[PDB]
Amino acid sequence: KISQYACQRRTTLNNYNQLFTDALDILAENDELRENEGSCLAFMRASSVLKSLPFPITSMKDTEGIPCLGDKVKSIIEGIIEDGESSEAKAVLNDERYKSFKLFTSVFGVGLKTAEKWFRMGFRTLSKIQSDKSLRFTQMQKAGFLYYEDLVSCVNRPEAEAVSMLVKEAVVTFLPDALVTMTGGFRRGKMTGHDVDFLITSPEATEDEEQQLLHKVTDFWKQQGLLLYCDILESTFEKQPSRALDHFQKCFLILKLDHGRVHEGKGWKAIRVDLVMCPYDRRAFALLGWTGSRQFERDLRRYATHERKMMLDNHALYDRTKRVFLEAESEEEIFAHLGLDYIEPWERNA
DNA sequence: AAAAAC
DNA sequence: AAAAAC
DNA sequence: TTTTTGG
Ligand SMILES: [Mg+2]
Ligand code: NA
């Protein structure tokens, strides 16, 4: 029997139903842009269960017993089996509101609100936006346009590994005992990604040392002419669990990666890097949260509430019946507390 | 406000 | 048919 | 959009 929760499935990078999940991913993106939460969530769950399957869907009998697939999803599956394409998703791909949303949000610093504001102002290309004498861009959007070609072209495992070394070298200069862990998609065994995420924690660090680290590291890169963009968000952490973002201290950077650190034109590459500074006692929760994937986390939180009367987030796990916070030194302990079998990072690609 | 994250 | 999906 | 409706 296949579970409706991504956290009770193994989802590797081997997808047998990519023609189906591409269509569902487009329809989900279309409902996410039109804000429609309900439909959007059902398509992501459908697309997610299909990625977990150890076989391709060739007939409608192949959908029997698979959760998450209702009358609409089955109609899209039946459409792809017949013509080999989705008329529903092809419609969305030719739709100007989607093309424009996909294009505008692809800029670093432009989200759903700016993309819609621009689409309603009659804009359809990034060229017309930059040429427009009236528009005023945020320091973030100015960075996003200035390094667009570098950011829109995915980062790879040699580059991510070159960034990891660079991050580690900067951190251990200020905190020798610091543990730096590459999270996100790369930790899930991905070959490519848009950014490289990191989790920094230090057992021997003082409270002042934890707060001043991201400033010490970013100014160090600024002095070396490597910092292209920087935004440090201060910690709001305590801790009341609620039914988003993390309260950990973090920063969103664009780093200059010299080609000589990887194995040309510029001699460097603009790379989007996220650094998350977390207290040592909360490290497993932060590592479980920043590893992802989005759907895996959503289902970990969903399973915890609905099947266990527990509240999980990036900071802690709370048992609602025992009225106590559950302590964990590893991701394996969080899974244990939840009553789940451990899922390896490269099996969380839901 | 809006954006940045899995 | 109506509602909640954390 | 899917699921649940006294499961
Ligand atoms: Mg990432
Ligand atoms: Na964006």
In chain A, the domains with their CATH numbers are: 1-94 (1.10.150.110), 95-153 (1.10.150.20), 154-280 (3.30.460.10), 281-350 (3.30.210.10)
Resolution rounded to one decimal, in angstroms: 2.7
Q: Which nucleotide is nearest to A41 (CA to C1')?
A: D1
Locate all alpha helices (DSSP H) within chain A, ordered by sequence: 18-33, 38-52, 71-83, 87-94, 96-105, 112-120, 126-131, 139-146, 148-152, 157-174, 184-187, 207-223, 283-291, 294-308, 331-338
Burial class (CB in 10 A: 0-12, 13-18, 19+), A177: exposed
**Any atom of strand D under 7 A from CB of A34?**
no
For chain D, which bases have at least one atom within 7 A of a protein Cβ?
1-3
Cα(A157)–Cα(A110) distance, integer angstroms: 26
Burial (0-12, 13-18, 19+ Cβ within 10 Å), A340:
middle
Method: X-ray
Whose tokens are 């409608």? That residue is A60
Nearest to A241 by CA among A309, A338, A337: A309
List the structure tokens of A154.
């995915």
The residue type found at A102 is K
The answer to whether some atom of strand C lies closer than 7 Å to the beta carbon of A38 is yes
Q: Which of A238, A247, A251, A249 is nearest to A314 (CA)?
A: A247
